[PDB]
Design a protein. Structure first.
Lengths: 12, 397, 72
């Protein structure tokens, strides 16, 4: 059970 | 008359900003500072302040207030800004203390500010100290002696060698207050010196001056509200100000210490997209969450930081949610890097530092403060003749 | 009673290496409470302590006037 959630933001 | 703090309801984000960033209330005899707090109404209300000198045990000292001030007490806060271009409208009040009315505070020692609201009614009241410089408090954390309480305790040992104040009866005059980070509730106070080896006192034992280690503060930085920044996943806007859901924390007492740095409680009100972070930050219901299955007692886990005075009001009491077996509660909080921690409380005010839901690891980076009260038996108040800061990145066992 | 370790090693690209020995003997000595109770009247039961910690902690491992500022 690989319960991992990537998050984050990117602006340019 | 043990006058104590009084938590408000509308007012939130009460702090003592000095030199920009927030601080703890411990102030120098002429250092300027403010009392930035924020009303959650567009009502440009009128908040009259006050100041009162106080004793060691916070009984209001019998000095006339023409003596520890020069100016006035009850005069409404002139300076205040309204929440500009935000979802939660609020009125940012602010007052520098070397201001027009009370043009300075002219006596060291304890104090208590009151923010009574437009008639006489104390909305809130915070405590601070204006310490004078006459001693040399040489302190340093160091690991305890007792092998049982050594992996999760931080003894504190130091001296007071002043070459300015010859102590009259140091066993009965020189009382000392020890603060863990900036907290006033867990202070280890009312301690007599051991030795007095000369003109300098020396406090060395490991019975009284021994703080629980306590693990590091958690945090979350919602610089921008709709982001997915540091452990704030699932931010959802729904017919209200934004909601910042935090990842379910886990009890760390049953684990090993992991190097995890913080700024010891202090928050940093801030946003991107904002010119002045004070009046342009936006409140946001953040949903905290604790997953502590080992925790089973009859005490209540309160949320705590520096943003809410380490207070223990019912608007910070975690709540067991049987649907998940996970504590949880929403707490409206201004944006920016914010620390906090889950401090159990007995049921009313007793904190129960031991058996805390986070841990007590001896090596955590706490910044202990030491204030040296003093009262010659001709004086009319308890001075504060020097503080010595010494944090626990130097546990010299 | 506990005993120490702590070998260290630092390598640049200074190159030092430190290693010592801890030491800790934190004992309640109930004998001393008994002895102090064998004295002109001192009827106490407060404990006693004998922390004797200590360590050793050994250790093992220009251009005064480079002529660039002259003739400014």
């Amino acid at each position: 059970t690989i319960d991992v959630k990537p998050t984050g933001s990117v602006e340019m | 008359i043990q006058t104590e703090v009084v938590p408000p309801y509308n007012i939130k984000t009460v702090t003592f900003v000095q030199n920009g960033n927030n601080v703890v209330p411990i102030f120098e005899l002429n250092s300027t500072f403010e009392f930035q707090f924020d009303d959650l109404f567009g009502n440009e209300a009128n908040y009259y302040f006050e100041i009162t000198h106080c004793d060691y045990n916070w009984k209001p000292s019998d000095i006339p207030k023409t003596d520890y001030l020069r100016g006035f007490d009850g005069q409404r806060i002139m300076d205040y800004s309204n929440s500009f271009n935000t979802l939660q409208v609020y009125s940012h009040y602010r007052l520098p203390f070397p201001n027009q009315f009370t043009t300075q505070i002219r006596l060291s020692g304890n104090y208590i500010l009151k923010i009574l609201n437009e008639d006489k009614e104390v909305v809130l009241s915070r405590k601070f100290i204006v310490y004078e410089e006459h001693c040399t408090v040489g302190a340093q954390v160091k690991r305890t002696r007792n092998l049982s309480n050594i992996n999760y305790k931080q003894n504190l040992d130091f001296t007071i060698a002043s070459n300015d104040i010859t102590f009259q009866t140091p066993t009965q005059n020189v009382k000392v207050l020890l603060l863990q980070n900036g907290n006033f509730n867990t202070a280890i106070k009312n301690i007599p010196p051991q030795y007095t080896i000369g003109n300098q006192l020396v406090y060395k034992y490991d019975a009284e001056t021994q703080f629980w280690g306590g693990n590091e503060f958690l945090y979350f930085e919602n610089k921008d509200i709709r982001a997915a920044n540091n452990n704030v996943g699932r931010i959802g806007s729904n017919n209200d100000i934004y909601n910042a859901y935090l990842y379910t924390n886990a009890a760390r007492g049953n684990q090993i210490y992991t190097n995890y740095q913080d700024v010891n409680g202090n928050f940093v009100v801030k946003n991107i997209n904002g010119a002045d972070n004070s009046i342009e930050a936006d409140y946001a219901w953040v949903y905290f969450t604790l997953s502590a299955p080992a925790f089973r007692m009859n005490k209540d886990i309160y949320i705590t930081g520096i943003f809410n005075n380490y207070s223990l009001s019912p608007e910070y009491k975690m709540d067991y949610n049987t649907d998940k077996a996970v504590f949880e509660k929403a707490v409206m909080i201004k944006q920016g890097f914010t620390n906090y921690q889950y401090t159990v409380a007995d049921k009313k005010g007793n904190i129960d530092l031991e058996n805390a839901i986070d841990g007590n690891f001896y090596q955590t980076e706490n910044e202990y403060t030491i204030l040296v009260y003093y009262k010659e038996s001709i004086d009319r108040y308890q001075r504060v003749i020097g503080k010595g800061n010494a944090n626990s990145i130097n546990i010299v066992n | 009673f506990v005993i120490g370790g702590t070998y260290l090693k630092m390598t640049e690209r200074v190159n030092n290496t430190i290693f010592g020995f801890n030491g800790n003997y934190s004992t309640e000595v109930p004998f001393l409470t008994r002895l102090a109770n064998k004295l002109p009247n001192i009827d106490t039961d407060v404990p006693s302590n004998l922390s004797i910690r200590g360590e050793v902690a050994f250790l093992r491992p220009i251009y005064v006037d480079d002529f660039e500022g002259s003739q400014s």
